[PDB]
Amino acid sequence: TRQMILAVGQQGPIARAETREQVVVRLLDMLTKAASRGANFIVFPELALTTFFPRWHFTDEAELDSFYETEMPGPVVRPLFEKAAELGIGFNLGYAELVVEGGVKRRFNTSILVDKSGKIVGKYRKIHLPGHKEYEAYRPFQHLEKRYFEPGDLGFPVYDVDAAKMGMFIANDRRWPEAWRVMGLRGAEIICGGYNTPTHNPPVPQHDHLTSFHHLLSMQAGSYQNGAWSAAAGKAGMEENCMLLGHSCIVAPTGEIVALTTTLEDEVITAAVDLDRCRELREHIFNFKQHRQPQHYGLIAEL
Amino acid sequence: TRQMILAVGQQGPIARAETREQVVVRLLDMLTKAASRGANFIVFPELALTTFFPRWHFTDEAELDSFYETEMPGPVVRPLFEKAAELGIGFNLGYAELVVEGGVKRRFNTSILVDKSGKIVGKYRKIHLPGHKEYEAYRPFQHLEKRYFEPGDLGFPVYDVDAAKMGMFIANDRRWPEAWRVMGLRGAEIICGGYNTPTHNPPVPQHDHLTSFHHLLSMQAGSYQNGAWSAAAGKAGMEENCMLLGHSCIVAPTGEIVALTTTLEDEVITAAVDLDRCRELREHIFNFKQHRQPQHYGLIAEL
Amino acid sequence: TRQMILAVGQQGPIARAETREQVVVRLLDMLTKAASRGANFIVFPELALTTFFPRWHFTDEAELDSFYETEMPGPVVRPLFEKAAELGIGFNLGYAELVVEGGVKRRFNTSILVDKSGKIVGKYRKIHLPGHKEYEAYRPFQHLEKRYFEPGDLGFPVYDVDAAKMGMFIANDRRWPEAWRVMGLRGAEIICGGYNTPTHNPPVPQHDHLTSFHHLLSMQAGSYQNGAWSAAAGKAGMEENCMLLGHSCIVAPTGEIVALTTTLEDEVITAAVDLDRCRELREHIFNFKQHRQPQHYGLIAEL
Amino acid sequence: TRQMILAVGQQGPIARAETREQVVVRLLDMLTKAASRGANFIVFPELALTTFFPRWHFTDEAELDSFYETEMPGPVVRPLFEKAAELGIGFNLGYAELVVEGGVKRRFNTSILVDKSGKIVGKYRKIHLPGHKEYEAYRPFQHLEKRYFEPGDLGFPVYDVDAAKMGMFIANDRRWPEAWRVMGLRGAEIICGGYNTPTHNPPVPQHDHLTSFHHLLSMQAGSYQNGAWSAAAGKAGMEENCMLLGHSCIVAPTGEIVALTTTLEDEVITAAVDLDRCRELREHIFNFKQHRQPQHYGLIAEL
C-alpha cells in the first residue's frame, strides 16, 4: 500500500512527581483516540515518559538515574505496546535510555519506532545535544543535555515501519539540515520525532517571540527539501514553571503544514498520508541523482 | 560597528528584442535609487542582461551565443561599474558567460560581486542547473539550462566584499541546503543571488500556487540555519508570455524577512544590515564548533 | 456537548458534462470517509453539484437553467441526505438555486446546512457577487456571477446545527470583514462555506501568486477577530481549462490553521473542534460587549 | 507620480526613570536616520514619550499626571518638530494627553500627525481601551488603560498629510476590523499607528506564543481588505520587567509585509510607498461602491 493516516500525540506538561503509570494512561488515551480516527501510527514527544529533567542541575546520581528507562518496555510501559498491537497502530516514543556496559553507565536521549504489530523496528539516539555544559546561575532553568546524555551512536537511520520508510529526529535535531539530508538520502518517506522547546531562551531572549516561527520553519523546509512527510510531537504547557512550545504538527513533502495543534495539553491531530506524494519532489525538482553535486559538498562532511 | 545598508534591485521583464544598452539604463536607475536611499550594495537578478533565453530551444549556435557575454565588463556594461564606484555601491550581477578554454566553448550561468569601488571582487558559476537537456514537447515553455550551461567550476566560494563576507548562489541553488551550508561553514555573513522562477512548473503544475511559498521558505530556512543575512533579486513579470515570480527579498540571520517587493517591475528594496547579528545564531544554537557532528554527515558528501 | 470533529470535503474539478449522479457519488464517498474518521459535519464547496458555469457567457436560458436546482434535494441528491442521516454527519452543500415566483425566475448562489439527522436547518444566499457584469472578450474565462445570480436576501444568519451555532459564507464573502462580523455578533461558533477561486485573475494578474495568501489571510483574520472556528471547502484543479485554488482549510478561533489540503482533487481533512475554545477570544480581548464602540462604527452601515 | 518613502521608528524600552529629554534625543536620532534614507514620514509608537505606565496601579494622582502631556509640543518635545520641518519629514507621535474641560480632567491615549513642515495636521484618541479598570491580583503586571484613559472622542478620522490620506489607529485598535473599515470607507491610503504589546497575556497565557502572529495578522488583513498601506511602530524590549513585542512593520495594500524590524531596540525601517497601488484593490475586488451591501451590515453599527 501507499496510503495511511498519520497521527501526532501532543503531550501537556508532565510533573516531576507524575508516575510512568499515569503517563501511560495519558499515552494510551491518545493512541486510542488516534486509532478511533483511523490513524495507524502516532508520534509522541521527546522524553515522553517523564518531566523534562535536563532543566535541573543534578548532584545525586540516583536521582538522575530515576528518570531513565533500564528496559523498553518495562512492566509499566508494556500496556502501551499491547494496545498498539491490539488497535493496529504503531508509534514513536521518546525516552531517556540508561545502559550498563561492563559496569559503565551509558546515557542517551532516545526514541524508538514500534509498528502496528506492537514491535520495536528501529531506534535512534539524539546526535545534536543542545544547551550548555556547566551550571549557569542566571538562567531560571538550565538546559544540561550535553551532560546527562552522550551523542547518539546510531547515525541517522531510516527504517521500514509497516510499508513506510521512516526516519527519526529528536527535538533540536530538526533544526539541522544535515540530519534531514542524511535521512532524505536514505529514502525516508516520513521523518518524525518529538520535542521540548521552552518559549524562553535565557542566552538569547530576543528570539523568544520567534519560537514558533523557528520550529515551524525547520519542519517545513526539512520536509520540502527532502520531499518527505514529517511530524513533530511536542510536550507543551507550563511544566515545572517552564513554558514549553506547542504547535505540534504534520507536514506534507511540499513543506505545507497539513495539521497543527492549538492547545497546550494532550492533543491528537491526524492527516492522511500518501507515501507516493514524495515523488512530486524526489523525482523532479529534488531528483537527487539528477541534480545534486556531492563533489562540491565535501566541506559539510569534514571533521 | 559593522553595519551597512543592503539593497535588492528586482528587474521587471526583459524582452527578447530588448538590448543590453537599454537594460543597463534600467540597472543604472535602480543602482542610483538604491544609493540615494543609503544602500552600499545592491543585488541584481540571474542573467540580468537579457531575456531568459533558456526557455527556447536554439538550432542556430550563433543566435544562442548572442545571449552570452565575452567580456565583463564590456563597453555596454562598463557604465554600470563606473556608477558603482562613483556612488560607492557594490553589486551582484548575473549574466550568461561564454569562455573558450582548451578548445571548448564553456558556457556558465554566472554571477559576480563588485565592491563599492567598482572592482570585481569574486565570481561564482551556477552549480545546480535545473530543468532539462533536450527539448520537451509536453512543456509550454522550455528550461534548457542543462543544455545551455555546464555546472560551475568554482565551488561555493565566500569573498570579502567591503569588509563583509559574502557568498553567492544563483536561482535554483537557493533550494539546496548544501549550497547554503558550504558557504555557512566558510563564514558567509551575507548570502545572495538572483533568480528567474516561472510561477508555472510544467512537470509538477500542482505546485504552481506554492511558487512564492517555496521561494521564501528556501531563503528563510537558509538564513536561519546558517545565521546569515540573505537576499534574492528576481526578474519578474510576464516575460515573453511566461510569468516570472516576484517577491524579491532580504532576510535576517534569524530567517525573518525584512524587506519584500510587491510589484513585478523594476523595484528597489533595502534593509539595514548588522553583520554582528550573525552571532546570535553562529555563537549559540548554531555554534557549529560546539554542536555539529560531521562524523555523521558523510553520506551528504558521498558521490 | 461542546466537542465535535469537523471535516471539509474538497472537490477536484467538475466537468461541464459530469452529471449530478456522478458528483453525488464523489460527495457520498467523502462524507463516508469523513464519518469513518469521526467527523459529524463536513463542509462542501460553493456550487458543489456542477462545473463553475459563471465562467461562460450564456445566450440560451435553457442552457443556463440546467445548472440550477429546482428543488433540494431532488431524487439524484437525496442519497446524500440519507447517507448523512445514516452515518450521523451533517454537511454544508453549495448549489445554484432556481426559484419560480408568480412566473418570475429568481436566481441565487446558495448553500444549506444539514444536521446529522439529515435535515436542512438553515440556508444562506451569496450577498457579495464578485466579477464583472458584461462580457469581456480579453479574459480567457469570464466571471459573470452578478448576472446569473441576485444578491442574497437572507442576510448573514446563524443557525443551530446539532449543538453548534453555525454561520455561512460563500466564496468571495470570506474576503469581507462585514460578513464575518455580522455572524460574529450573532454568536456563531463555526463559520463555514466553500469556494471557486481561479489562481489567475485577468483584471489584476499581478496578484495571481498571492491567491493562496489572500485566501488563507481571509480565513485566519476572520476566525481570529470573531473568535470563531471556520472552514473553507474549495473545488480545485484544472476545471474546463481554468486552474482553481486548493488549500481548503479548517481554522481555530485563534486564527491558527489546524488542517489544510495539499492535493487538487477530492480530499477530506478533519480537525477536532471544541466549541468553548471561542471563549478565549470572545470573553477577553474580543469581549464584544466590553470593548466594542458601535457608536463610532456608523459609517459601516450607511447606505 | 504620488510616491513617497514611509518609515517606522520602533522604540526600544523606556525606563520609568528615563526622562522625556532623553527620549527625544532617541526620537531625533531615528527621525534623522530615516531622512538620510529618503523617508518623508516616520511612524513612532503609542505613548512614545514615557515608559508604559498603565502597567502600575497609581494611588498618587500627582504621580499619574506626571506621565501626561499638557502641551503638544512643549519645550522638551519641540526640538522633534523643528527637525521634522528642517529635514522635511512628518511623523506620527503617540503620547498620554491630559486636558481639563468643563471641570473634568480628561485623559486620552493620543496620537498626532505632523506633516513634513512641522505642522500638526490632525489628532486621534484611542477608542478601544484594552485591559481593565481595577487592579487585578492574578496579573503579574497591570494594564489599567480603562482606568487611565477615556475612549477617544474624535471617531476614526482620515487627514490629508502631504497629499497622502492618512488614518490613525492606536495599538489595540489594529485588532478591530471596524476601525480599519471606517477609515477605509473614508478613503485612507495609509493607515498607521504605534503599540505596546506585551508578549505575555495574563488572562489568556496560552496565546503568548501567538503574540507576533496575531499582531501581523491584524496588520495584513486590515491593509488587504481596505486596499491601504499600513505601518505599526511598536515600543519593544524588556521594559520594567515586562517584555514587549517587536516586529514593527510596513504593509502594502495587498497585505504583503514589505518591511519588518528584527531587533527589540530603537530601529528604523522604510519602504517605498506608491499611493496609486491602493487602486489594485479599491478599484477591483474591493471596489466598495460596486460590491458592498451595507443594507446587510446594520448589526455592526447597532448599539
Short mmCIF file of C-alpha atoms in Angstrom, two decimals, chain A residues 29-171:
data_model
loop_
_atom_site.label_atom_id
_atom_site.label_comp_id
_atom_site.label_asym_id
_atom_site.label_seq_id
_atom_site.Cartn_x
_atom_site.Cartn_y
_atom_site.Cartn_z
CA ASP A 29 -5.82 7.51 25.73
CA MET A 30 -4.20 9.36 22.84
CA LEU A 31 -3.28 6.20 20.97
CA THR A 32 -6.87 5.01 21.41
CA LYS A 33 -8.42 8.23 20.11
CA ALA A 34 -5.95 8.42 17.22
CA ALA A 35 -6.91 4.86 16.28
CA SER A 36 -10.60 5.75 16.51
CA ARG A 37 -9.84 8.38 13.90
CA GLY A 38 -8.22 5.90 11.52
CA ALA A 39 -4.56 6.56 12.27
CA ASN A 40 -2.15 3.62 12.05
CA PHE A 41 0.84 5.44 13.56
CA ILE A 42 1.16 8.09 16.23
CA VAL A 43 4.20 10.26 17.07
CA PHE A 44 4.90 11.09 20.73
CA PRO A 45 7.17 13.77 22.30
CA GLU A 46 10.87 13.66 23.13
CA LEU A 47 11.37 12.04 26.57
CA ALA A 48 7.63 11.34 26.72
CA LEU A 49 7.69 9.27 29.93
CA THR A 50 8.99 11.92 32.31
CA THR A 51 9.19 15.62 33.10
CA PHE A 52 11.96 17.41 31.22
CA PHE A 53 14.66 16.79 33.85
CA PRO A 54 17.54 18.34 31.83
CA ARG A 55 16.33 21.70 33.21
CA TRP A 56 17.72 20.94 36.68
CA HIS A 57 21.33 20.68 37.84
CA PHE A 58 21.68 17.24 39.44
CA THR A 59 24.05 16.27 42.24
CA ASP A 60 22.58 12.91 43.29
CA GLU A 61 23.19 10.29 40.57
CA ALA A 62 20.46 8.04 41.99
CA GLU A 63 18.14 11.00 41.45
CA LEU A 64 19.23 11.38 37.84
CA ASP A 65 19.08 7.65 37.09
CA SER A 66 15.44 7.58 38.20
CA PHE A 67 14.47 9.47 35.02
CA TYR A 68 15.90 6.83 32.68
CA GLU A 69 14.50 3.56 31.37
CA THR A 70 16.60 0.45 32.01
CA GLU A 71 14.47 -1.65 29.67
CA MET A 72 11.98 -0.96 26.88
CA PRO A 73 9.33 -1.66 27.56
CA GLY A 74 9.19 -2.27 31.28
CA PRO A 75 6.06 -3.65 33.02
CA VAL A 76 4.55 -0.16 33.35
CA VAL A 77 5.02 0.78 29.70
CA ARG A 78 4.13 -2.61 28.21
CA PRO A 79 0.39 -1.82 28.17
CA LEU A 80 1.15 0.80 25.51
CA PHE A 81 2.70 -1.79 23.19
CA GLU A 82 -0.18 -4.19 23.79
CA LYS A 83 -2.75 -1.53 22.96
CA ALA A 84 -0.68 -0.63 19.90
CA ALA A 85 -0.82 -4.20 18.61
CA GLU A 86 -4.49 -4.53 19.54
CA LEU A 87 -5.68 -1.45 17.69
CA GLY A 88 -3.13 -1.83 14.90
CA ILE A 89 -1.34 1.49 15.31
CA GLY A 90 2.40 1.99 15.58
CA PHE A 91 4.17 4.79 17.38
CA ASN A 92 7.31 6.83 18.01
CA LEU A 93 8.17 7.01 21.70
CA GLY A 94 10.93 9.15 23.13
CA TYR A 95 12.61 8.28 26.44
CA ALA A 96 15.82 8.54 28.49
CA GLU A 97 17.90 5.42 27.88
CA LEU A 98 20.24 4.05 30.56
CA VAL A 99 22.53 1.19 29.55
CA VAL A 100 25.11 -0.55 31.74
CA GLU A 101 28.05 -1.99 29.80
CA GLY A 102 30.80 -3.73 31.75
CA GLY A 103 29.88 -1.70 34.81
CA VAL A 104 29.91 1.53 32.83
CA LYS A 105 26.72 3.55 32.50
CA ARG A 106 25.83 4.95 29.09
CA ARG A 107 23.19 7.67 28.72
CA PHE A 108 21.23 8.57 25.59
CA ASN A 109 18.24 10.71 24.65
CA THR A 110 16.36 8.01 22.74
CA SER A 111 13.35 7.34 20.51
CA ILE A 112 12.03 4.09 19.05
CA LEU A 113 9.66 3.08 16.29
CA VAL A 114 7.02 0.47 17.02
CA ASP A 115 4.96 -0.89 14.10
CA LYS A 116 1.26 -1.72 14.14
CA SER A 117 2.07 -5.23 15.39
CA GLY A 118 3.48 -3.70 18.57
CA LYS A 119 7.10 -4.48 17.74
CA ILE A 120 10.17 -2.25 18.02
CA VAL A 121 11.55 -1.95 14.49
CA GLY A 122 14.15 0.76 14.94
CA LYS A 123 15.91 3.12 17.30
CA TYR A 124 17.66 6.48 17.18
CA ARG A 125 19.77 8.34 19.73
CA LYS A 126 19.93 12.16 19.79
CA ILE A 127 23.06 13.26 17.95
CA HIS A 128 22.87 17.05 18.44
CA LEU A 129 22.83 17.80 22.15
CA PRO A 130 21.79 21.47 22.68
CA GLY A 131 22.29 23.77 25.63
CA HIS A 132 25.32 24.41 27.79
CA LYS A 133 27.56 22.07 29.76
CA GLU A 134 28.04 23.86 33.08
CA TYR A 135 25.58 25.27 35.61
CA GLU A 136 24.60 28.87 34.81
CA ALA A 137 23.18 30.58 37.91
CA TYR A 138 21.38 33.32 35.96
CA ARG A 139 19.06 31.02 33.98
CA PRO A 140 15.59 30.46 35.54
CA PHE A 141 16.00 26.89 34.31
CA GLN A 142 19.04 25.06 32.91
CA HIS A 143 19.44 23.01 29.74
CA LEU A 144 22.12 20.46 30.60
CA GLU A 145 21.59 17.77 27.95
CA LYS A 146 25.28 17.70 26.95
CA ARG A 147 25.86 16.44 30.48
CA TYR A 148 23.05 13.94 31.08
CA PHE A 149 23.34 12.42 27.59
CA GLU A 150 26.01 11.21 25.17
CA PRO A 151 25.81 11.98 21.42
CA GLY A 152 23.80 9.29 19.62
CA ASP A 153 25.88 6.46 18.16
CA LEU A 154 23.39 5.17 15.59
CA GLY A 155 23.75 7.91 13.00
CA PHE A 156 20.51 8.93 11.27
CA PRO A 157 18.98 5.59 10.20
CA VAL A 158 15.80 5.00 8.22
CA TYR A 159 13.59 2.01 8.95
CA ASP A 160 10.75 0.19 7.32
CA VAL A 161 7.66 0.56 9.50
CA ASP A 162 4.60 -1.13 8.02
CA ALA A 163 5.27 -0.35 4.33
CA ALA A 164 6.62 3.14 5.07
CA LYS A 165 10.27 4.18 5.20
CA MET A 166 10.64 6.28 8.35
CA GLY A 167 13.49 8.30 9.83
CA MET A 168 13.83 9.79 13.32
CA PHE A 169 14.96 13.13 14.72
CA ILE A 170 14.80 14.29 18.32
CA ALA A 171 13.92 17.88 19.21
#
